[PDB]
Amino acid sequence: SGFKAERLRVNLRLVINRLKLLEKKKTELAQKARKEIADYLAAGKDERARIRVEHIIREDYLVEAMEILELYCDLLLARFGLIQSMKELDSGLAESVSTLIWAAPRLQSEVAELKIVADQLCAKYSKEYGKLCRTNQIGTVNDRLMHKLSVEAPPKILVERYLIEIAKNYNVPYEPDSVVMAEA
């Protein structure tokens, strides 16, 4: 198998600590980035402000995804007894285990330990289950997290709404795209 329970336990703790730092850091970098949007709006460079807002939306979704994975790591730590007890997958862990396996190849650039967590879960359960997770053929990965780590561009109505609210907060004039706002 190659499964070592203390590898899984140690790395789940490391993943939580690293995600808790990245949430904080990426939240602060969004504060700095929203002022940059106001600067483009003040300069009347609205078409670039739209594209810079897509960066902020993606990092905001990412932070919300990190909060979900930090919760599923802490759930596996809370019910770690069941992992090392049974050989079958408990139904209460199914969402958590499948999601962490699905997320790992997306997040492994930033959270190196999450690669190791997924490896260990794919050792404890079958390599086959480990494949059904990565494709969500298993039909168990958390939908709300899959949405937040999608590669698609934001809805253009969201981009406009972001600009409107940033414009308000920094007291900068902005007029949204009527062609987009008609789709509301």
Binding site: R7, V10, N11, R13, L14, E113
Partner: protein, 50 residues
């Protein structure tokens, strides 16, 4: 180099060991302090302290 030869897993291990060994050295001082307390039990009667 340093983050290779002392990776976070190896640090986690070291920290857990550190803590567990200080739990031991507290069990040890407790039982030394109870050995001295019973050895000198006639020099400090409870009622005289009270």
């Amino acid at each position: 180099a340093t983050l290779k030869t002392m990776n976070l897993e190896k640090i986690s291990a070291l920290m857990d060991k550190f803590e567990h060994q200080f739990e031991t050295l507290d069990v040890q001082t407790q039982q030394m302090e109870d050995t001295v307390s019973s050895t000198t039990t006639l020099t400090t009667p409870q009622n005289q302290v009270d």
